[PDB]
Design a binder for this molecule. Sequence first.
Ligand code: TEL
Length: 50
Amino acid sequence: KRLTQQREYEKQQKMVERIEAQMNGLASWSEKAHAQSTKKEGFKEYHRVK
RNA sequence: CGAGCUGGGUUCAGAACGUCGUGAGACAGUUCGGUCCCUAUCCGUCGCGGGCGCAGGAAAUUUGAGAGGAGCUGUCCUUAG
Ligand SMILES: CC[C@H]1OC(=O)[C@@H](C)C(=O)[C@H](C)[C@@H](O[C@@H]2O[C@H](C)C[C@H](N(C)C)[C@H]2O)[C@](C)(OC)C[C@@H](C)C(=O)[C@H](C)[C@H]2N(CCCCn3cnc(-c4cccnc4)c3)C(=O)O[C@]12C
């Protein structure tokens, strides 16, 4: 039972670190995609919607 | 300056790559293809007429108020090594 609970805790801790990493990558893209708008090509809301 | 024109780019539907997302999809990217409608009423422009005016009716030649246009400049020689 200690092996079962240790495997399931290792799985949810690994999954938590994975989703926090893939959430941080999207944040570091949303900061760029908000700051690098308003420069050229399309007004400023076609790029703010992204 | 698209009721003047083009539509190559970008931001419609197809599709693909890189990348993200479990996912439908998305871009923090790139790539190929993609319907540019309208018989001009008025003003406004460019032209041409028709009426009347101008104290008679006519034919010609006109002054010019005013207005538009034009208004650019190279090189070579001489002066003179
Ligand atoms: C043929 C010209 C067409 O114009 C355009 O489509 C296009 C050239 C334009 O630019 C036009 C002016 C557009 O306006 C623009 O709209 C934009 C959204 C906005 C723009 N401004 C507002 C900024 C505005 O200018 C708009 C919205 O049209 C979509 C006008 C709107 C009233 C229409 O939809 C309109 C009724 C179109 N239509 C709908 C069917 C279209 C499918 N179809 C295509 N071919 C056939 C077909 C062929 C052969 C036989 N039968 C059918 C059928 C037609 O049948 O004819 C149209 C008038």
